[PDB]
Design a protein around this nucleic acid. Structure first.
Ligand SMILES: *P(=O)(O)OC[C@H]1O[C@@H](n2cnc3c(N)ncnc32)[C@H](O)[C@@H]1O
Length: 386
DNA sequence: TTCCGACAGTGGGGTCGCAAT
DNA sequence: ATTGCGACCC
DNA sequence: CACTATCGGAA
């Protein structure tokens, strides 16, 4: 049984990367990993893999051992539940490595994830990247940009390959279902194109799309396309001009000469009941990442709340022994959890001097209230007040 | 010397499908 | 059948 | 969807 030789090289590789300090030194050690350590990293990082479980039983393993090929086979097929039923026939080191596949090797903390792994080992697994927006900042505004409604719903990319076959995928490449069938029927007439849109109810009932970008299928897969925004927009309008059904799906935009015009558009959009606005530079290219070619304008409320509780950092995290999240209440009676906005030192102070905070007032920033009345996207702005 | 892009590591509110009751 | 938790939305 | 923290090259 070659099991214990493989569990040792895996445990040795993870410890070697964790002991390396700095990003550069961690990547040169990542290049030296074995076949088996490579496979476990792929199993944890692959965004299109699932296992059905997040941890084995606390019965752990305890001697014996299972063939590493059998383990990798069970993980690849998504049979995590079957693996857990046989978990005590694993060795303890095996169960520690497998639990590390699920939670990210927290026992070792090597400090390398998808960014470092794909840099050292390109194309080890498939990823999905779309254009994302940076935060609104007038200092970065480019003159004569275009303002657009930030539509409600979910991000949805529609890709029509060269055979005319279409798939709807989400922001992270997962399938999207129940789109109006007229939409697929008409888009199949434009093979070799990907359309960036938002899916939402026209108001179960089938969703419709608001399309705001279009990229050729090959350029989309290559993650490279140098046509600027306004030309990309006009190209979409012309290729759909003869199809009125598709043409009406195109989202409108408004020229904003100055950043104060963009702010005015955002306020008009808020007055009409929309979430906010997106500002798009007329010279910006689709970059398949996050940059200021797109910038989002979203509301942000500020309120004073009373700390009424706390929760320690979850097991094996860097926040063990200090505050992971605060429990706050405001004047409406709503109770919301705040998990970010505090420095590491502030998390430790509150944990120790809990008398200073048990019912004191703090300042919380959030986007809006949910339908239940609690905060959406809450964050702490001030631990104490002056 | 500092600024910042890239990256790793935390956390929240909500919906839905399916395995295990 | 319901319950819960994995897996994904924002 | 958020914020903090750290490396290490750009500024
Ligand atoms: P987040 O608050 O970071 O905002 C980005 C997402 O907003 C959605 N969205 C709505 N409307 C648009 C337009 N017109 N253009 C681009 N993105 C839009 C997307 O789903 C983004 O992921």
């Amino acid at each position: 049984s070659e099991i214990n030789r493989i569990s040792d090289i895996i445990n040795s590789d993870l410890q070697a990367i964790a002991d390396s300090k700095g990003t550069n030194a961690k990547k040169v050690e990542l290049a030296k990993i074995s076949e088996y350590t490579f496979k476990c990293f792929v199993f944890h990082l692959d965004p299109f893999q699932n296992f059905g479980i997040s941890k084995l039983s606390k019965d752990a393993g305890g001697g014996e051992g299972i063939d590493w090929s059998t383990v990798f086979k069970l993980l690849y097929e998504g049979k995590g539940r079957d693996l857990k039923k046989r978990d005590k026939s694993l060795t303890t080191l095996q169960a520690k490595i497998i639990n590390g596949i699920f939670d990210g090797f927290m026992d070792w903390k090597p400090g390398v994830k998808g960014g470092s792994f794909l840099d050292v080992f390109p194309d080890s697994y498939r990823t999905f990247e779309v254009q994302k927006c940076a935060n609104w900042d007038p200092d970065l505004f480019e003159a004569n940009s275009f303002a657009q409604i930030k539509f409600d719903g979910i991000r949805c990319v529609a890709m029509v390959d060269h055979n005319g076959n279409l798939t709807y995928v989400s922001r992270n490449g997962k399938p999207v279902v129940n789109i109006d069938p007229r939409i697929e029927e008409n888009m199949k007439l434009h093979p070799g194109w990907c359309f960036d849109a938002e899916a939402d109810s026209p108001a179960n009932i089938k969703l419709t799309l608001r399309v705001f970008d279009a990229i050729p299928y090959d350029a989309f897969l290559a993650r490279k396309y140098d046509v600027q925004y306004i030309e990309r927009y006009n190209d979409l309008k012309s290729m759909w001009s003869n199809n009125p059904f598709l043409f009406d799906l195109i989202a409108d935009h408004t020229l904003v000469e100055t950043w104060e015009d963009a702010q005015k558009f955002y306020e008009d959009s808020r007055a009409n009941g929309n979430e906010g606005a997106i500002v798009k530079k007329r010279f910006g290219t689709y970059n398949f990442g996050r940059d200021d070619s797109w910038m989002k304008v979203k509301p942000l409320e500020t309120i004073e709340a009373r700390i009424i509780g706390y929760e320690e950092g979850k097991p094996k995290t860097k926040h063990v022994g200090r505050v992971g999240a605060l429990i706050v209440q405001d004047y409406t009676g709503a109770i919301s959890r705040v998990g970010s906005g505090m420095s590491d030192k502030e998390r430790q102070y509150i944990y120790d001097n809990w008398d200073e905070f048990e019912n004191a007032l703090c300042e919380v920033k959030f986007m809006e209230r949910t339908e239940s009345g609690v905060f959406r996207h809450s964050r702490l702005s001030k631990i104490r007040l002056d």
